[PDB]
Amino acid sequence: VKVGVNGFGRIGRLVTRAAFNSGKVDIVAINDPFIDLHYMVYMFQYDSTHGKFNGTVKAENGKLVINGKAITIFQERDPANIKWGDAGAEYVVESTGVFTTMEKAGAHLKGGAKRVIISAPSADAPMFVMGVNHEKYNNTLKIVSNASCTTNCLAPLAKVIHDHFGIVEGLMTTVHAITATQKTVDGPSGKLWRDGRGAAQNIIPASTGAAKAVGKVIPELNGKLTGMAFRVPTPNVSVVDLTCRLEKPAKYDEIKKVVKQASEGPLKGILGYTEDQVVSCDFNSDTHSSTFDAGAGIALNDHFVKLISWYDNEFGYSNRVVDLMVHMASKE
Template sequence: MPPPVLRKCFLNTRLRVKPILLTLLISNQVHLTNIFLLNIAKMVKPKVGINGFGRIGRLALRAAVEKDTVQVVAINDPFIELDYMVYMFNYDSTHGRFNGKISTSAGNLVVEKEGKATHTIKVFNLKDPAEIKWAEVGAEYVIESTGVFTTIEKASAHLKGGAKKVVISAPSADAPMYVMGVNEDKYDPAKDNVISNASCTTNCLAPLAKVINDEFGIIEGLMTTVHAVTATQKTVDGPSGKQWRDGRGAAQNIIPASTGAAKAVGKVIPELNGKLTGMAFRVPTPNVSVVDLTARLEKPASLDAIKAAVKKAAEGNLKGILGYTEDQVVSTDFLGDSRSSIFDAGACISLNPHFVKLVSWYDNEFGYSCRLVDLITHCASKA
């Protein structure tokens, strides 16, 4: 028998696992065998730049290393020099020391972790995003995590440097918002060059609201998020340009605050537009927040039926996005949790079959950062 002639037929495999077809020519007979290439995502990953190396920028890099589905090739921050980046990434008061190795080489940041791809990252220190040469390092996708450039016009400055797509790590007044597990299928690569990953709270609320609305219908609802402190708050009392009480000491107070997270759900789930609103209480904990959704339902539902619906979604099509627990948990139990929303079955209550209070936890830093990476991965799969 003559040796087989092998012909590799590589298809476009940008983050989609497709077979390599080996054509075996033996005795004038053609046999086609599909061999699935393992770890194909490691061959072709979207190249990512990060603008702003603050809380979300640094945790987005950690998420990128951990998930191993994107390649971070550049970071820009005008206020943080390379050596300081090493220190800030390596040591984190909330999430602990980075479980890997970080170093510098020829002016680059080098991030390594056993079993994961190495990220060799070009560092820029530019204030104007239009001047960042993303194309030089091949960065197609930019995570805009400064909190400053949150509109299409401002974030589009990254496109001038060669980026193809920009993902804003905050709500946006005009950029389309996508929440993984809820409406990412609406992403249009032909026109969506600047998009928003919405807020961490919207990422927690929207998957839960989707399940409840799909199964039972939501007539109206009020959301409260009990939210951990963020960098925008004051360590001690100081002036505030908006609400005066926003300037009160974060470590000393529970501070009522506004949030557009509930209204934003109406943008990602159009059927709920105008049906939800909410507020926040900022509390003196460093991380992990919790959403309380109080809703009036169209269809009568027992609490057990609601729990069953959420559990089914958490174990099915929303696995990895929505979680479910019946344990007697507290906030620190979710530190480092990569899911967007973890439903607390034991904390939920019902007044009657049409009026319920539902509770869901979220790591407002790391969980959200994981969704940034997932959204880019999704966008790349549509390129």
Template sequence: MCFIYSARPGPAHYGFSWVFGNSIYIQLHRDSPNSLAFITMAFSSLLKPTASLVRPSHRSQASCAGLHHSSNSVKLQSSVFGDAVTILQSSSLQKSGACSIQPIRATATELPPTVPRSQTGGKTRIGINGFGRIGRLVLRIATFRDDIDVVAVNDPFIDAKYMAYMLKYDSTHGVYSGSISVLDDSTLEINGKQIKVSSKRDPADIPWGDLGADYVVESSGVFTTIDKASAHKKGGAKKVVISAPSADAPMFVVGVNEKTYKTNMDVVSNASCTTNCLAPLAKVVHEEFGIIEGLMTTVHATTATQKTVDGPSMKDWRGGRGAGQNIIPSSTGAAKAVGKVLPELNGKLTGMAFRVPTPNVSVVDLTCRLDKSASYDDVKAAIKYASEGPLKGILGYTDEDVVSNDFVGDSRSSIFDAKAGIGLSKSFVKLVSWYDNEWGYSNRVLDLIEHMALVAATN
């Protein structure tokens, strides 16, 4: 077993590590204040037992002949592994072509990344209001996490039997792999765990406290303001997470600004699926090169609000046209919302959407003017470093010839497509990033809740 450490200049804050053969390569920046922490993280990852991996995941591999070029090395004996540790002090970074890293491949078999437990002595107990696309997937995903316990679901339009059916069978994500049974009109049993079912129209009437739910996922699409969502607190809920953009609730994107959450924020928004895709990408590009201004287009899969055939839509005439027959231009606030989670980009981004006749997976096109001169390869390298380091599990990277269906069931918020983008000049680039607008977003809803629980526990 061999460890190789390489100190190198820029980009500003990102480092990465990868496995090749029997060696672990750790690449950090010379001035990074987090170098020791990153090395510790890399060592710790080796100690995790492989038995803890429930399903296979694709590890990145590398071929880096350039690492042996003009480097001074010192061998140390490791008391942990009993093998030599080689420390390389590199004088300069090899050109991006010198190190070829296999990208993370999109897969529907990966479990969602587990965030630290809240350490409250048990799982974080949540309730779900609204059993639509997001509500059902939040429940599906939660049943495979060991840090979340769904105790109740409320939907005034769906009874227990129909809930069980809709959870089990999904035309996009397949048949649910766990066990589901209906015990009575108000109780489901999922994987041996009982979940209470209610059908209240008014959030204030849902007895969340009696049902044991501390956090509520507001996924009905109706109660999206602080005032309306706060009605859940009357029934005993402590915190509410709105699974949609909100006009006035604090907005969070995990991996971007969740650390600004404060315990006095009782109602928060998880933003939109598109903002969750765009914000991590914009964060990396802006921190490394500076974004002067940018335009975003999302090519977005069909959603439940669209019409199957032409129908009335008084506020949006084009939105009333048949979803399966048309490419429909539409508005979106996703790009402007990035300015709420990254204030330094406020007023610098805007965008629009094209709704297309596919059932799932969307893609963001960010075209932006950079403050610092950078080639497209420079931008790719910065995104790759971030995807393998501080934003791993949130931001992905691929240079394979992928299409939208390859990302169905991908739990990451944003997967950068290195081959799809292009650079016009040293300061003008088009960046492309994929996202499962259902599955990835639902994972982030739960990650945000667990982060809130962790903050509550530490305070």
């Protein structure tokens, strides 16, 4: 399937790298009115977090050429003006962070795209997490959401725990890497006051809908989870901390066994499992959605436990966007 990327940012660029690394997906067009062609060569080639691109990137005849694949470059603020159909882009990855509703994301369809994958939670577009509910996708859905990074970490874990022991209720904290929405020094941040405080100086509480959204991809958990976030001074890699009450008793060793088993079978590549003494950097460019840290979590008793799972918020999620597109392509 031929793909367009709208917003060539952290997500858009790393989706682009994921497509090339793999390849039942072919990137054929990119729109970003804030990054011109020669600037795109530079932004793609060099990455502070994930290293230099391994391959060739060059501007040739007005196109962005990556490992010899020519890509059509647009510069449009309004998605309805991008000529996706002319460029052959069938699916568009909407990774700007400003077109997340059905109405706004649907502008791509006016440019000749057939489907849109919103790289963020959406107020109304249906949400999918690979490994949890992606089989619920069907051919009639032209606009879909791949949820958030944090939902993609929590939901595969919550699926396994709920399937085996039953989650009565749970409360989640994510300790999350800084993102582009933050500020280098104390400055204005509209209505999200805390988010405007200097990113590398602070632990910053933030709200997040990611735990409540698990109740949408796992409908039995509707109303049974919520949570909040702390942003902290690292440039990538995040961690979930799920505190839950279970219906059936589970010794921590039984939790470990069921999770490990899930990592080796049905959720292989989505949900990882470790007993090693890891820290966040050990998940740098890790492609899993969620990796359970057996050593880090703790039980109070057989029904009340705190479970820890790591996620490379940029790189795992960008790989999942690609995997969702491959899955949608298989149901055409």
